[PDB]
Design a protein around this ligand. Structure first.
Ligand code: TOF
Ligand code: MN
Length: 222
């Protein structure tokens, strides 16, 4: 399964627009009324203006070819200081057998480039903005982890209920797509920001559609 559409909010719509227009190219970013969309391979993200008094941010990982990590890292570093953790500007996660690259955007989103060494294809050609494959990860920060895992399982997603941990982060998915299901509070790696509940909507490849309210409740829309 893949993310076809992702709806996120932002308190820096104008700055966000310029940032991504400069990063992805005018041919991948469409400005709309009080919102704009960006194209990331087979995935699309619409950023909508956030409600006053709030400054939403999320953790978004973008898939890139197994052999494009170094190039992706260099490309990403041209748009912002690369984030570090343990004084390292990149990380290797053995569970996903992937290398990841991080940068913060104007609204404080943790933008990540993830290169899956075996779960992503090898593209014998130069990396470029046009080479972003799709959304590989998105955080589902909920006020009730067990309830979300349940409804997600009901939505027919790969879920091991007896393995879900309410107080921690839980990887839900397979192949090149994982939902980072967890509670608010914990600091995000490569970031000063701690997990906080913010609304969002998501439409998957299989027609499944779900949203997270401002309360943090996960609810299957479709
Ligand atoms: C546990 N874990 N595994 C993989 N990737 C991450 C990650 O990107 N971030 C931001 C995070 O807080 N935790 C992670
Ligand atoms: Mn990640």
């Amino acid at each position: 399964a893949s993310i076809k559409q992702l709806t996120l909010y932002t308190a820096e719509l104008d700055r966000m627009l310029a940032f991504y227009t400069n990063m992805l190219g005018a041919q991948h970013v469409h400005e709309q009324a009080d919102a704009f969309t960006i194209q990331l391979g087979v995935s699309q993200i619409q950023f909508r203006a956030a409600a006053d008094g709030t400054k939403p941010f999320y953790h978004i990982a973008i898939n890139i070819a197994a052999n494009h990590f170094q190039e992706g890292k260099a490309w990403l570093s041209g748009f912002g200081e690369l984030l570090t953790e343990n004084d390292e500007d990149q990380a290797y996660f053995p569970f996903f057998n992937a290398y990841s690259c991080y940068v913060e955007d104007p609204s404080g989103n943790i933008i990540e480039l993830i290169s899956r060494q075996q779960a992503a294809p090898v593209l014998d050609k130069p990396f470029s903005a046009d080479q972003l494959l799709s959304i590989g990860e998105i955080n589902i920060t909920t006020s009730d982890v067990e309830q979300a895992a349940t409804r997600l399982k009901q939505a027919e997603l790969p879920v091991k209920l007896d393995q879900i941990e309410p107080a921690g982060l839980n990887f839900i998915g397979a192949q090149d797509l994982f939902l980072l299901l967890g509670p608010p509070g914990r600091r995000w790696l490569f970031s000063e920001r701690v997990a906080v509940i913010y609304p969002l909507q998501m439409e998957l490849d299989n027609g499944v559609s779900l949203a997270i309210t401002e309360t943090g409740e996960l609810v299957i829309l479709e």
